[PDB]
Design an enzyme around this catalytic site. Structure first.
Site, PDB file in Angstrom:
ATOM      1  N   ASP A 106      -6.180  -3.232  -7.972  1.00  0.00           N
ATOM      2  CA  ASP A 106      -6.887  -3.803  -6.826  1.00  0.00           C
ATOM      3  C   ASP A 106      -7.056  -5.266  -7.092  1.00  0.00           C
ATOM      4  OD1 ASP A 106      -8.631  -2.813  -4.339  1.00  0.00           O
ATOM      5  OD2 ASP A 106      -9.534  -4.610  -5.173  1.00  0.00           O
ATOM      6  N   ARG A 137      -6.970  10.353  -6.408  1.00  0.00           N
ATOM      7  CA  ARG A 137      -8.142   9.480  -6.379  1.00  0.00           C
ATOM      8  C   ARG A 137      -9.469  10.232  -6.363  1.00  0.00           C
ATOM      9  NH1 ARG A 137     -10.602   6.683  -6.872  1.00  0.00           N
ATOM     10  NH2 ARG A 137     -11.886   6.443  -4.992  1.00  0.00           N
ATOM     11  N   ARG A 166      -3.926   5.920   0.854  1.00  0.00           N
ATOM     12  CA  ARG A 166      -4.532   7.109   1.451  1.00  0.00           C
ATOM     13  C   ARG A 166      -3.706   7.828   2.467  1.00  0.00           C
ATOM     14  NH1 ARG A 166      -9.143   7.643  -1.037  1.00  0.00           N
ATOM     15  NH2 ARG A 166      -9.624   9.485   0.292  1.00  0.00           N
ATOM     16  N   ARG A 173       0.807  -1.229   0.000  1.00  0.00           N
ATOM     17  CA  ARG A 173       0.000   0.000   0.000  1.00  0.00           C
ATOM     18  C   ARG A 173       0.818   1.246   0.000  1.00  0.00           C
ATOM     19  NH1 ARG A 173      -5.168  -0.283   0.003  1.00  0.00           N
ATOM     20  NH2 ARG A 173      -6.271  -2.189   0.639  1.00  0.00           N
ATOM     21  N   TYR A 202     -14.157 -12.969  -1.253  1.00  0.00           N
ATOM     22  CA  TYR A 202     -14.876 -11.748  -1.602  1.00  0.00           C
ATOM     23  C   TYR A 202     -16.084 -12.059  -2.435  1.00  0.00           C
ATOM     24  CZ  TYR A 202     -11.304  -8.703   0.223  1.00  0.00           C
ATOM     25  OH  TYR A 202     -10.386  -8.075   1.011  1.00  0.00           O
TER      26      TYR A 202
END
EC number: 4.1.1.37
Lengths: 357, 357
Positions: B77, B41, B32, B28, B155
């Protein structure tokens, strides 16, 4: 003043003694997977249920009417301790537990009660324990319990569950002193609470360090382990001074594979395991002295009764017939089938006997 | 047709070679915690960002302008694969990823595309990779990546994250055949996708089995491990047949302490570790052949820069100077301080050199 215990297999295994079969119980055996639990719980709100001795006693007994479990565990919740400490909690059915006003800064510790007064705030739990011990009439031992200091700290700081415990771990790294202060307040409240549970009738105690896994070895040894050791030392000391017999104590560190070696030296008779630790490796880690508890994947109960039987047979072969109490690797889930829980119980009894004869 | 690599420390360590210092990157690193990431983003919705080569390239390069990281990892992703398989996904900022219509019964597999056509659906990722490899101009290697079959299955069946993976594990226990069918579809889509990533310019590949921990050894060996082995075998085979040089492959099983031994024999050059596994124990488990990657607690970055330096020094002492790539034990969190990430990077470089001279 209580009925004499008839089946003490659980306690004998906890102390490390040879028994005729492996005793078995299930975390959350009083839970939503039982329709009767949902119905009894629908009578009031969550914490109002925890506060009614009769309601706790009933929920505690329900699984025993369905299955020949070797221990009962008092119905309560680990969150009763931070609530008695002065924090406001809510148990919203969709979400789970919640503290709308979590501890976030050091000054927030000022609103907590002196830990010395917590046990008086938890008299309702002592009442439920005395009542259930009477009603069980010696059928099997009654286990009392509480959350471990770090795990309780996580709920108090996070305000509920979390996939990372980032706020609580941030406290460990940025506010180490406040963190130790909070963990010590929690320890000082847990000791008299656990001692009171035994005074009320509990015959064994389990400390749930359910959030151990978020910490690695280093943080765990600094912030979780000292308080886990202190709880056992002080509980046994107070019980002795009070003239009572200590009871076997179980430490369950969920996802705590990395701490098994220290946990086996932490003063607990039994070390509970999650399903990710292979039984044989756990045995190597803990040694030949302590009793192991666990550790079937709770989801294994979604398999057929016949598969459950095989999975149980394999689990028992790995643990061996000594120093072992069977249980799942975590609590039962709300959507599990009561008949599959029964299949689990029966398989442990059946296969443990075959494994000795 | 790409610029020649200038700093190949990362690749040399991945292959097990001695290097002058320990290379370091962070899961990562494009995330963020960087204000510039949030701003880039904010230009579009999540998956629209993943679909713009320039936007992916920019996000990939941002951390490299701040820190001397030894590898870049393409911004994308893991959920792009189930989306190319025909599932509708949404990335709602408050919640996270979501599949409003998760797979729940066996018949739901009928709506998925033939895995053979997935790579064509993922051409935008190949474009971003080619573009970033050009723009990096050989500064450091570019890592491509995908989620592992079991983790992607979670998922698809859960519809998003979960603390227990009860629905997906229920599939393993009650629908084993459908489960293998789904895992095989996922493997058959991942192989051509990963091969296409290398054809587009990726110089290393990481397979993220982020949800390994929910499975214990038995289920992991039955349902996760075979497909993890197959992905590496087939990717290397196809690259060879295509005339290309295989690239080092990293298997990261988060909370996978119990599988380290099998993972070290699964065909990957590097085994990534979470922060709960002590480096020395991981080394015993994996052996002396594979390279280890990791594994600092990401929350350690909340500590002061000076403490971060000490924690890093200790981590490097445990791993030793051979067969090691430094990284955190999981991805960076949104509230971490970029300066602390810089402190981490600098400490690894500083201490790894001291540890050799």
């Amino acid at each position: 003043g209580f009925p004499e215990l008839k089946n003490d297999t659980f306690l004998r295994a906890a102390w490390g003694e040879e028994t005729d079969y492996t005793p078995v119980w299930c975390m959350r055996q009083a839970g939503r997977y039982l329709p009767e639990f949902r119905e009894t719980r629908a009578a009031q709100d969550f914490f109002s249920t925890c506060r009614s001795p009769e309601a706790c006693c009933e929920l505690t007994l329900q699984p025993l009417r369905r299955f020949p479990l070797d221990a009962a565990i008092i119905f309560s919740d680990i969150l009763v301790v931070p609530q008695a400490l002065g924090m406001e909690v809510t148990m919203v059915p969709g979400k789970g537990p919640s503290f709308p006003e979590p501890l976030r800064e050091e000054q927030d510790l000022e609103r907590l009660r002196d830990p010395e007064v917590v046990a008086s705030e938890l008299g309702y739990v002592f009442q439920a324990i005395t009542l259930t011990r009477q009603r069980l009439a010696g059928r099997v031992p009654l286990i009392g319990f509480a959350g471990a200091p770090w795990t309780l700290m996580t709920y108090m700081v996070e305000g509920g569950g979390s996939s990372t415990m980032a706020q609580a771990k941030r406290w460990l790294y940025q506010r180490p002193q406040a963190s130790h202060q909070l963990l010590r307040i929690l320890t000082d409240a847990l000791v008299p609470y656990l001692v009171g549970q035994v005074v009320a009738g509990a015959q064994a105690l389990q400390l749930f360090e359910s959030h151990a896994g978020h910490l690695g070895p280093q943080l765990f040894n600094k912030f979780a382990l000292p308080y886990i050791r202190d709880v056992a030392k002080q509980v046994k000391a107070r019980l002795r001074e009070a003239g009572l017999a200590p009871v076997p104590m179980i430490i369950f560190a969920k996802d705590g594979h990395f701490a098994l070696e220290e946990l086996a030296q932490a003063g607990y008779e039994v070390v509970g395991l999650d399903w990710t630790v292979a039984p044989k490796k756990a045995r190597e880690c803990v040694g030949k002295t302590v009793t192991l508890q666990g550790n079937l994947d709770p989801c294994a109960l979604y398999a057929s009764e016949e598969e459950i039987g095989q999975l149980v047979k394999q689990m028992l072969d790995d643990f061996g017939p000594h120093r072992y109490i069977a249980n799942l690797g975590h609590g039962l889930y709300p959507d599990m089938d009561p008949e599959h829980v029964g299949a689990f119980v029966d398989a442990v009894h059946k296969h443990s006997r075959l494994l000795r004869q």
